[PDB]
């Protein structure tokens, strides 16, 4: 897995158009103030263990989010972070599990729609730990 | 080289803190509207031909800018896109070259300062061609 964590003043998104692999979603729009925007590409290597990958992901998000003491998390699918991607079915599963585990761990979570073209607005805080990239293993 | 090209309503930035390799500059604050925000990671392979990499990158930016009829370009150093980076000195050279060549080809260019932690704000348009990733080889 590849992840970009952006410590943000806000993140808003608006689904605009479906791709062929668009997911049913219960929020085509969303806004979250002061958050860790986690842009995630679920990778082919992640298919070896999708459940372990979601745990590995939450573990790393916690590591950074505890270091910033942020409780607000956006799970934002972002395929462009990798050139060797997982299947859409597996990616959706991992992203949904990440949201589930984080919610279970008392985090405030917003998940952007998988497989939709989305307008978005983000403001990065710009401190030395405000943009971090992480490679994640199960 | 890895680039992510985002068709944006705006890109704004504010350099906040220096790193070890912060470039010396006056342009520490900036904004461009209706722009192609080009997040660029210069890679180890690019060291073999820095000028050629720059020319290749400009060619791809032009293809997208011409397809979307965009004239405003932001050159944004973004190491996060790649796990196999060139040296810092190589990276700034190539980024500076991309900026100078785009300028000589008639584009309005703003380059975000290299080696500074920066706050930034962006708004992605969200149409199907608004977020494109490209590998550049030279
Ligand atoms: C394009 C860009 O602007 C947009 N933001 C986009 O990335 N769209 C992707 C992801 O939301 C999702 N998707 C498919 N596979 C994956 C994967 N392995 N990991 C994460 N997302 C995936 O499906 C869309 C088309 O590939
Ligand atoms: C901090 C982070 O969130 C910020 N946004 C950042 O990416 N900072 C990078 C670039 O500005 C630049 N830089 C150094 N090497 C490279 C490279 N190979 N390619 C591109 N830029 C580089 O130097 C910084 C640290 O590597």
> Hey, where are the domains in chain B?
1-136
Taking alpha carbons only, the member of A48, A43, A53 closest to residue A98 is A53
How many other CB atoms are found less than 10 A from the CB of residue A11? 25
Taking alpha carbons only, the member of B5, B8, B3 closest to residue B122 is B8
The continuous run of DSSP H or E covering A84 comes out as none
Is B47 exposed, middle or buried, given 0-12, 13-18 or 19+ CB atoms closer than 10 A? middle
**Distance of alpha carbon B65 from the chain centroid:** 13
Question: Looking at chain A, how many residues does it have?
Answer: 138
| Count of CB pairs separated by less than 8 Å, A with B | 60
CB B36 within 8 A of CB B6: yes
Give the dihedral of Cα atoms A38, A43, A47, A51; nearest 10 deg.
-10
**Distance of alpha carbon A15 from the chain centroid:** 16
B18: tokens are: 């220096």
Are the Cβ atoms of B131 and A80 closer than 8 angstroms? yes
A125: tokens are: 């805080």
For residue A120, give the 3-state DSSP assignment: strand
Quickly tell me which residue has 């978005």 as its tokens.
A120
Atom 14 of ligand 1, residue of closest alpha carbon: A88
Residues 6+ apart with CB under 8 A from A27: A110, A111, A113
Q: In chain A, which residue's Cα lies nearest the Cα of B128?
A: A117
CA B3, A80, B68, B13 torsion-angle sign: negative
Residues 6+ apart with CB under 8 A from A24: none
CA A111, A116, A118, A123 torsion-angle sign: positive
Quickly tell me which residue has 């943009």 as its tokens.
A131
**What distance separates the 2 farthest-apart alpha carbons in chain A?**
38
Architecture of domain A1-136: 3-Layer(bba) Sandwich (3.50)
Give residue ranges with CB within 6 A of ligand 1: A 19, 21, 40-42, 77-80, 85-86, 88, 91, 114-115, 117; B 131
**Distance of alpha carbon B115 from the chain centroid:** 13
In order of A36, A61, A120, B122, the CA distances from A125 in angstroms are: 10, 17, 16, 12
B116 CA closest ligand 2 atom index: 11
Quickly tell me which residue has 């990239």 as its tokens.
A133
């Amino acid at each position: 897995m590849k992840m970009l964590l952006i410590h943000s003043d806000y993140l808003e998104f608006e689904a605009k158009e479906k791709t062929k692999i668009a997911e049913e979603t219960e929020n085509l729009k969303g806004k979250l103030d002061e958050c860790l925007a986690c842009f995630i590409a679920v990778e082919r290597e992640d298919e070896n263990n999708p459940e372990g990958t979601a745990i590995g992901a939450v573990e790393e998000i916690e590591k950074v989010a505890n270091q910033l003491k942020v409780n607000n998390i956006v799970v934002y699918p972002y395929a462009h972070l990798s050139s060797d991607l997982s299947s859409p079915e597996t990616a959706v599963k991992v992203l949904k599990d990440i949201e589930s585990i984080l919610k279970e761990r008392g985090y405030n979570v917003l998940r952007a729609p998988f497989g939709w073209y989305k307008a978005f607005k983000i403001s990065c805080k710009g401190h030395p730990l405000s943009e971090l990239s992480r490679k994640i293993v199960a």
